[PDB]
Amino acid sequence: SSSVPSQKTYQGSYGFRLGFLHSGTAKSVTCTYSPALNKMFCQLAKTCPVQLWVDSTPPPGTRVRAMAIYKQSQHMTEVVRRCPHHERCDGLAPPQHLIRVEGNLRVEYLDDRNTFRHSVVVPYEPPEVGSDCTTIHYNYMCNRSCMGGMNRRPILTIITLEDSSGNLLGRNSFEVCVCACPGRDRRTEEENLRKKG
Amino acid sequence: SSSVPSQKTYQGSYGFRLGFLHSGTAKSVTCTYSPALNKMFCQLAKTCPVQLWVDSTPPPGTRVRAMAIYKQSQHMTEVVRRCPHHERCDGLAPPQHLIRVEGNLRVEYLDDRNTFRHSVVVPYEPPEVGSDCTTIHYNYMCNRSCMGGMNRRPILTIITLEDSSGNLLGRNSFEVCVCACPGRDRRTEEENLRKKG
DNA sequence: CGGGCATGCCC
DNA sequence: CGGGCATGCCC
Ligand SMILES: *C[C@H]1C(=O)C2CCN1CC2
Ligand SMILES: *C[C@H]1C(=O)C2CCN1CC2
Ligand SMILES: *C[C@H]1C(=O)C2CCN1CC2
Ligand SMILES: *C[C@H]1C(=O)C2CCN1CC2
Ligand SMILES: C[C@@H]1C(=O)C2CCN1CC2
Ligand SMILES: C[C@@H]1C(=O)C2CCN1CC2
Ligand SMILES: [Zn+2]
Ligand SMILES: [Zn+2]
């Protein structure tokens, strides 16, 4: 009955975890992940690699879904959407969707008929031989600050592993801040965490 | 042949001048006019009174037109428009128009067929007996900072007095900055003028 | 109300 | 590149 999807971490029977490349906090970096905050800082429309880790290999036909939700209680029931400006500015991705996947010939974009929430889905592919994870290249097509979209409200990205039958196999999430200067904003929030948290 | 309307002050044979109420520079004022900068600072969608002064009474059927243009040379040829967000948010005023007139049952909104520029027109009415000017209540429906609209670019409002035949009778203009805190921004720009101009 | 931070971006 | 200002708004 809820229109708010779960954000509860569920590693599940396949040991599903997310991973992120080690970047620095240089003021001009295009993205950087804070493990202390479980938070990705990245720039508008630029690659944001997410690693998928599993302890056991999911069955054939497993799918990987990404969806954004507002992190604060007072905004959780509102659907996260592209702002009118960037919407009016790919072909496969409808202009209303915040999250895109690049580099994948099998991407599917969903608008839920009951909850109206947007998600983007790709097939799960096992890591190549010798590699321990699979990487998906996400793109966030608005800044957190965009008026008429996120309007400065923080968001979570929820990644779910789902089998072809629709069984939830795993769930993980991270906060995302799409901003002009990811390195500066990570440094500021981490400093604020240490001194005022 | 030019698609850029004139901004040249032309008092004309009727002695046409603009006037503005004396406001202060309190941080929360809804609008304030700087004579030193010939610049109105005002808030989004709130009243911005403009006084019309004439030395001689224009003929019956005179009209008062307002139009915005970008002040900087590099943007002058681009049409000033409402941003996509506030456009998607009166009835008589088309959503694309930046400048509205409130309180007037005879307002006309024009989209020029050749230049595509927007303007808003009302009849000229002489001042009431004993009064020296006529006031028009303008509304600016975007902030200067709106992405996809003015996008932080400065603008002029050009007020023209025109007879019913379309003869230009007078022209005046002022800079406009639609901002959150008109009193603060006037104080800052005037201080910057005095010390760095 | 006014002080002050967060965030985009400096033509 | 990084320093720093301008501007919206603080839940
Ligand atoms: C944002 C992400 C990238 O695209 C590379 C630079 C920074 N971070 C790790 C690798
Ligand atoms: C963070 C800041 C920089 O360092 C350049 C890229 C992003 N932003 C504007 C210029
Ligand atoms: C903005 C304009 C108004 O509406 C009154 C207050 C400030 N200024 C003069 C009168
Ligand atoms: C300027 C500042 C104020 O003083 C209030 C009105 C406008 N802005 C936000 C709150
Ligand atoms: C997760 C794993 C790694 O650490 C590197 C880059 C991505 N994957 C294969 C090698
Ligand atoms: C221009 C003139 C004034 O100064 C007051 C207010 C508006 N007009 C009539 C009286
Ligand atoms: Zn946007
Ligand atoms: Zn706007």
Author numbering:
A (entry chain A), B (entry chain A): 94 to 182, 186 to 293
Question: Which sentences from the paper describe this structure?
Answer:
The human p53 tumor suppressor is a 393-residue protein that in response to cellular stress, acts as a transcription factor by binding as a tetramer to a wide range of DNA response elements, activating various events including DNA repair, cell-cycle arrest, senescence or apoptosis. Mutations in the p53 gene were observed in more than half of human cancers. To uncover the structural basis of rescuing p53 mutants by MQ we investigated by X-ray crystallography high-resolution structures of the core domains of mutant and wild-type p53 bound to MQ in the absence and/or the presence of their DNA response elements. These studies reveal diverse binding modes of MQ to specific cysteine residues that stabilize the proteins and their interaction with DNA.
In addition, we present the structures of MQ bound to DNA complexes of the rescued double mutant R273C/S240R, referred as R273C/S240R-DNA-MQ, and two types of MQ-modified wt complexes referred as wt-DNA-MQ (I-III) and wt-DNA-MQ (P1). Soaking of preformed crystals of R273H-DNA, R282W-DNA, R273C/S240R-DNA and of wt-DNA in MQ solutions, led to MQ conjugates at residues C124, C229 and C277. The MQ-modified complexes of p53-DNA show clearly defined MQ conjugates at three Cys residues: C124, C229 and C277. MQ-C124 is well defined in five structures: R282W-DNA-MQ, R273C/S240R-DNA-MQ, and wt-DNA-MQ (I, II, III). In addition to interactions with L1 and S3 residues of the same p53 molecule, each MQ conjugate forms stabilizing contacts with an adjacent p53 dimer via its polar L2 residues (S166, Q167), and occasionally with the overhung G12 nucleotides. MQ bound to C229 is observed at high occupancy in all p53-DNA-MQ structures. In the p53-DNA complexes where the two DNA half-sites are contiguous and hence the two dimers are parallel to each other, MQ-C229 conjugates are located at the inter-dimer interface. MQ-C277 conjugates were observed in all structures of mutant and wt p53-DNA complexes. In the other MQ-modified DNA complexes, the carbonyl oxygen of MQ is oriented away from the DNA and toward the L1 loop.
